[PDB]
Amino acid sequence: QQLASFLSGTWQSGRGRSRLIHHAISGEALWEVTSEGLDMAAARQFAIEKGAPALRAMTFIERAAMLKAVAKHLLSEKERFYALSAQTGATRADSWVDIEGGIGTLFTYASLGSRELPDDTLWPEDELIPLSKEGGFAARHLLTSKSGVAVHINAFNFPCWGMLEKLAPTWLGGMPAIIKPATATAQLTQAMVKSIVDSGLVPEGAISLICGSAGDLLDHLDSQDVVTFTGSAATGQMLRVQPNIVAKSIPFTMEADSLNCCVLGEDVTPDQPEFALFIREVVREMTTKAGQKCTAIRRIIVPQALVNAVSDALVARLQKVVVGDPAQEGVKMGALVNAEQRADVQEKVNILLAAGCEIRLGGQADLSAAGAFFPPTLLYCPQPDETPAVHATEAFGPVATLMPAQNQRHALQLACAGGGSLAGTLVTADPQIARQFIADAARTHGRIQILNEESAKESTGHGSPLPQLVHGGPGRAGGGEELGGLRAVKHYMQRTAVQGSPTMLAAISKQWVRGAKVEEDRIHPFRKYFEELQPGDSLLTPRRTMTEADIVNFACLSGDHFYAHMDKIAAAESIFGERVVHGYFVLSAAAGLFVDAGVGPVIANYGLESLRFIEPVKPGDTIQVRLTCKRKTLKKQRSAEEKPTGVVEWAVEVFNQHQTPVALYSILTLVARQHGDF
Amino acid sequence: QQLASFLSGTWQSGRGRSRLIHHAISGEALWEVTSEGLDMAAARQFAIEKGAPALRAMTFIERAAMLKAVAKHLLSEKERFYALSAQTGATRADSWVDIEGGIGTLFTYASLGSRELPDDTLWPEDELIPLSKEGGFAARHLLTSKSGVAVHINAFNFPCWGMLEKLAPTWLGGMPAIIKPATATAQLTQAMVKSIVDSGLVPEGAISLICGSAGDLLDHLDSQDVVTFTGSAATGQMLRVQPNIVAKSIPFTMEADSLNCCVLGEDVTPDQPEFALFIREVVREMTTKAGQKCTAIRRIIVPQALVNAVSDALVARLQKVVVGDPAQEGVKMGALVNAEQRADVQEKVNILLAAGCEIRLGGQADLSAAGAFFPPTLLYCPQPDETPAVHATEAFGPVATLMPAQNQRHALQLACAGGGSLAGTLVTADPQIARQFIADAARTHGRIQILNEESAKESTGHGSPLPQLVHGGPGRAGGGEELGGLRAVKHYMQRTAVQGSPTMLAAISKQWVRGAKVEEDRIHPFRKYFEELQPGDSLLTPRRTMTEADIVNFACLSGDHFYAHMDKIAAAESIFGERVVHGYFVLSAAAGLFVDAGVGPVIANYGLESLRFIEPVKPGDTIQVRLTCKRKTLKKQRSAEEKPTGVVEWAVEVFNQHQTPVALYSILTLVARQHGDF
Amino acid sequence: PGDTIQVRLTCKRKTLKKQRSAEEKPTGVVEWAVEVFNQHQTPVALYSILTLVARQHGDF
């Protein structure tokens, strides 16, 4: 039964050398996978010529909506993916974390994209940077989608989450994706790809899949392509030195095997709840996914005195875990994905034992059984500082080593001795211990969780990588970063400093910037609908003279009698030298000047972005307000009856009678739209 | 005369194979450089053991102050550097751009560090990310200094700017630097290093210099080290595939040769000022530094009709440039740095001519003269789309090629055909042309300037890389990024997502976060000095009942009679369903509730960071304010008489009678300090 | 209290004023009818205001 790969817009399979996908439980070969003789250059060309322009033509809002629609479509058909994930030897809980994590990642990226990405094909990331005394020359940073292709090479650990976690920012960045999943679990990935292709929610060529060898795809890539890799250190190190990749300076991101630690604080004792939740956390991370998650705990660092206690409390809890076929009731842990994986894990355990380690709970597995089952294994290292192999060798299975520490600094040294890790946990109740541990060991771990009684109530766990947080680490972990929210998007884009006149930068950004040309229409901007508004549509308001009465009345009404406003004697000795107008009164008076009272397209204010008071305002000063449309962001209608609205940001500039700016800030608004989009 | 290298805290030179530094004008060998037999592992160990902890112990404010002090010290001794830069064959203008650019970079990084980096050894980059319904589990990103060493390998182009542009963010990131300058101009770099070492403003081992070969330093590096490279593509590609670098996943940044373009818009005509300033820009970039700056213009893309005009206007302007010894009056352009450089430039010119190019102004140089002089050269390509060598070969000298374009899209294709560039210029007056050009060609250029009449008045130039903007580009440009303001700092740090209870994250960050434990002292927080304040010091204010009178009075005083507040009929048909209290009145009433009136440590408000109105406030609702100290930032005294002040950020949470948060924002304040620091 | 007022302002009459000199600002008298209604559209106030409005073109 050939596993088809989707490339050049067609489902096709290769001929020649084939690799077998076996059922993890049954042991029967149920797929064979090959891509020999398929034209990889044609696949790349197809993705570039039509997928990439179609994605680039879409705005970020449209791409976020496409992600949301794809997330809903995939969620509707989750049962198929559950059935196919059962073939990988994962329980319902493991399939839940994989599939729902993937779909949750898509939802989260869609929400983030909708909330805080521009309604444009270009992304101005920062505010204008002044570079001249007159303000005739400035610059700002843009992010533009790369015109090439993103090549994602995934591991077998998360066939579905591992795809969508890279696919969501790749698509949100406007880049077509070619996905090369790990062979061992490729059959699952294909199914989701099929769904997406059959959804008709994506442009043609926006997604391609290669089942089997990548052939010579990496030899056909150019400067505008990117490569992401997850798997063994050796394979990624081989790919990093690819002559074509190094010649064209192609961005290459690698995530590799990591020795994730779990440090027990010296403040905790067996009587504390911290002890119990530490044992529970370690066992959960060891047993979930048969410890085949890249964030599973491999090293357990505990105080010397506590060792003999912990070694008991784990084993008993680790004894209750039942390893078997997840279909039958009473199994809480499945099997590994492959017999080859089991042999590898056994080899790693044997290496650790040969390098001075003691079995606390069984490390020998049956290397003749049809199922790829491995018993929960706990090892012990009496000399952690004299055994380097415990800090270099990791078993990609339900295997962890516990080691003693002293004086809370030896623990930090042992945590840092990993040579770089993806995740770390410290279990403590003392804030100072947490501070010291982070300050000394965050440089070697990409994620650290401080687990206490308060956190454990709703903690998503040590091993679950959330889409709002970075997934990566230095050194042995590979040196990549992923899933850092919008950070990930910026890996599929080119950052360009654009210099020039503010007017030119405003036109380039399709956002008004300080010092740019404005349009005054003689129609008040708040009376215009979202569609009639343009960035640069501006109003110069009537003036208002600030009086001593204004200071007194605002201080009375607000209750703020701060000495700088209401005490002459003290204000004489202040930096200003006399009593001044309240900053918030300047803001309030400005609002009075520019706001149109009538019922209109403006729905709500709801926001104020970045307020600085530059110059004091004195009685007898006269303020004037320039109100300019800065940025427009359409909001997709969540239903059919909802009022079609858009987010409009307005730059407000408040000047005095000398035209010197006294207040500069931005307000957010909701403006009603004439035309909806269901 | 041996050129000493500063490593292991000592000035020392090597023995054996030596390379000669010649005077660019005279041609006499005046230095010889060698580092054979010097212990590179000892240098690395020395930098790591004492330089790195000493830098890491310092806060960002202290490190910014160290940068500022070093900048002032270097500026005091600039004449020595001018005299030594004269030996490199650079004019006073070129030496000015190099030395003052370097010192300006140091000043700018110091200012940026002082303004917007925390008063701590850790850097929380973002706001708290909620990850639970109760708010018991959250996460935020920290940046921590790497414990290793930064190895900077620089080019001969900017011996001093090229060092300081990397040194300023490396030190601001808390990382020791080992600098390997290009041999050809190493004598200049050494001098500045000497000054720094002799300043006593830096910790011991915070800076090392290697003059000559790097030996086997790259074989001794670990996961916590970083490498930056500038120079030829071949050398950087060789370094990228170093077995030790690829094994330990050591961050490697490369900047390589780029074919910087200058596109002339189709809207411009010879009668327009745009034409003149285009000619002036192209000639300036060609002639400055004898075109040895990495951002010099190499390709000139002009409309077909304009070609014969431009080809004339350039040549005449290019004829007036006098090439000779800069010491004698009437030379506006110096020589190249080396005879080897001259031979290389001549070889590249000959390659271009062999690949179908025509001389418009002389390309043949005297390869027997003592001085490394090269005449200003202008070439012409009749078939730009049929000659690939014009889009791959660059001459690192005063050489540029002009080529025709058509229909404004062929120009964009030719600009993108460079395969990635550091800088690009478009000369135009039409905003739509600028928009199209950016939208289609920003993905292949790291910096683009739109040059018009308005910009040219104070434009710093096409070739000058400013410290607030990114310096880098994809593909042929190397794929690095540098000088992106604080972005650069983050390349020398590890980004770690820290998860846990808000209380633990507040302790870890030394900044109060939403939902964390607070301290109520029964002393009002505004009455405490900066030193007595702690993040988490909080006050729960008295309550104030919002009334219809309050709405009317605030609308009257401010002048804002928006229908949502002052019209019952319209407010009935709004989303809220009845008239509500002004958001700014909620803000003003909150200020009245928490502000202490008395003369005290609080000096000014000056700021409001991020305001969102979550829930409407109705008449008969009662508001209460929780005011908490969020972040403290000490300000270094610029003089001895200045009042010692610090920036304190306060989180303000305004609730209604149901304890539901109606306003969440942050205010900035200046708080006086008891103890100054001169 | 609790009534909501709305105002219709309409130009009622225009009366040009002859310039007495050459430097005087050319102005005209404009009368405006003001109608103030409540939420039931029942008129609660009816009156006229006088105004001086500047002219673009004078007549010496």
Author numbering:
A (entry chain A), B (entry chain A): 2 to 679
C (entry chain A): 620 to 679
Sentences from the paper on this structure:
We determined eleven structures, with three having four identical molecular subunits, three having twelve identical subunits, and one structure each having 1, 5, 6, 24, and 60 subunits. When compared to the range of atomic structures determined by cryoEM in the PDB in recent years, we can therefore conclude that the system overall works well for nearly all specimens amenable to single-particle cryoEM. It is notable that all the structures were obtained with a single day of data collection where the number of one megapixel images in each case was between 350 and 500, equivalent to 20-30 images from the current generation of 16-megapixel direct electron detectors in use at 300 keV. The resolutions were all sufficient to build accurate atomic models (2.6–4.5 Å), and a majority of the structures (7 of 11) extended to beyond physical Nyquist resolution, indicating the power and importance of combined detector and optical performance.
Two of the others were essentially at Nyquist resolution (catalase and glutamine synthetase at 3.4 Å), with only PaaZ and the 70S ribosome at 0.9 Nyquist.
